[PDB]
Every structure is written in C-alpha cells, then in structure tokens.
C-alpha cells in the first residue's frame, strides 16, 4: 500500500565518515553540515561529493527553533546584551536556546547557514524544532495560532529559499507534525517528507497505543499524499541481549506495517555512530 521510497536510512549527528556511509549501503543519510558541529568542521563539498557518487542522498540537520551555542553564527555579544528572540536555556540539551523564531535576524541566520549547506552540495535539509513553536505557545508568548502560523511560514520560506536555488532539494520536517492542524494544505504539498523521534518507544519502553495512533493519523495522511516518513526510535540498548534484539524487530515490524522507514539508534540518543546490527540494519 504505502509509499516507501527509501529501504533504509541513517541518522548520523556526530564521527559521521563520508567513505563509511558511501560502502554502508544506506540509500540516504541524515548527518551534521559539519564533522564536530562548528565553523571548522564544515564538511567540504568533495567530502560530501563521495557519498553522492555512490548513490547515497545526503542531507542536512539544521535546527531551526533553537540557537546552537557551537555554530558559526552565534555571538560572544548576545552573553552581554542578548537579543530579544534569543530565550532560555533547554533544559534538556545545555548550549541549545529556544529562540522567536518569527523574528527577521533569526529567519536570517537560517537563511545564512541554508546557503552553506546549499554550496556543499547536500540534497535535503532536515529540520528540528518544529515543535518550538508548542514551547512558546505554553509559555503565553504569543498564541497557539499565532505560533504555528509564523512556524508554518517560515518553513514555506525556507523551501522558497532553497528552492530558488535547488529545485529538487528534499525537506523533511522533525516532529512538531500536528502543526498540520493548521496548515492550508500548502505545507503538506511543500514537503518531501516527515521525520519523527519516538512514536513507537520512548527509548526502549513501548509507548501507550493511543499516543502513537494520534501522531500516526498525521503520518499516514502525509503518506498517501505521496510523503516518505523517516522514524527513529531509541531502542537499541547496545547489548545483544534477546529482550533488546525483540524489540529491534518489534520496531521494525511496527514501522512498516505504517509506512514508516525505520532506523533503530542508541537509547543514549547521541547518534554517535553508525549504528549496523548484524541482517537488521541496514536490511539484508
């Protein structure tokens, strides 16, 4: 039934090796635009080149809801006199920032790192935070509609942006999916696709059933509009214990009984390594 484009795929934010993932054999890869996340670390274009050349799709993690303290762009200035979109900490990732996404200097930083990314030679852009826009929602910032308009445009004028330059160039949206509640319809055709974290297990602990249906009505109504989706669940504990190998292959079986394109990664989350389990992944 499903459309299912890609057999495999890999999520690979930190040590990903261009000449490893070319001979993995997984079909796209999504990785860092550069090899420890800095200036310096960019990727070169003929690093990036070597996985193109052996029919890999590349593409690119940029976090569009949060500032990363690490990146070209951010500034010793905005410790002293912060700037009015740049907000708390995350709790939960320290040197991550949620940020007004709304705001014109922040659309600009995005549109600045989209065009190195564009000049590297990747062919999508994967992009994470989505979901800022529910954090100021339940922070009373602006409202709830407000917040998933402003988001769902900027995600329309990040595919404007690189479109113009790239026609072909694939977005893949990261969770945040029920902002759909308040799409048009225009955002569901702009996308390639749909990435999401945790809609099977949170880690290795099964989630309730109900909880995934919900996120899955989104997920299938984008599928059989003729979207891919990408799941990542964090379930393999590292062991190759019985308990963890049944729950890989539980994953595994539930995703595609949905459409859904798995990769089973390190219940750490650090998405340090390529992470291959012996006629799993990637699939015989």
């Not at 009505?217 to 062991?239: A, Q, T």
């Amino acid at each position: 039934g499903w459309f299912m484009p890609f057999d495999n795929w890999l999520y690979q934010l930190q040590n990903a090796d261009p000449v490893e993932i070319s001979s993995s054999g997984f079909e796209i890869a999504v990785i860092d635009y550069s090899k420890d996340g800095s200036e310096s670390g960019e990727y070169s274009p003929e690093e990036i080149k070597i996985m193109v050349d052996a029919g890999v799709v590349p593409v690119a993690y940029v976090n569009i809801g949060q500032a990363e303290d690490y990146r070209f762009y951010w500034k010793e200035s905005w410790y002293t006199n912060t700037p009015e979109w740049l907000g708390e900490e995350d709790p939960a990732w320290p040197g991550n920032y949620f940020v007004k996404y709304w705001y014109n200097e922040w659309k600009e930083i995005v549109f600045s790192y989209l065009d190195r990314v564009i000049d590297q030679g990747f062919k999508g852009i994967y992009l994470d935070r989505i979901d800022s826009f529910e954090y100021w929602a339940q922070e009373g910032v602006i409202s709830r509609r407000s917040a998933a308009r402003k988001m769902i445009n900027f995600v329309l004028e990040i595919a404007e942006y690189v479109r113009e330059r790239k026609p072909d160039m694939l977005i893949i949206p990261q969770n945040g999916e029920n902002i759909l509640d308040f799409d048009d319809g225009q955002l569901a055709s702009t996308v390639s696709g749909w990435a999401v974290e945790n809609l099977f297990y949170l880690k290795t602990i099964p989630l309730e059933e109900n909880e995934t249906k919900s996120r899955l009505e989104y997920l299938i109504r984008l599928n059989r509009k003729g979207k891919f989706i990408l799941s990542v669940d964090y379930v393999d504990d590292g062991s190759d214990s019985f308990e963890n190998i049944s729950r890989i292959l539980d994953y595994y079986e539930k995703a595609k009984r949905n459409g859904c394109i798995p990769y089973a990664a390190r219940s750490d989350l650090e998405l340090d390594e390529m992470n291959v389990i012996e006629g799993i992944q990637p699939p015989e």
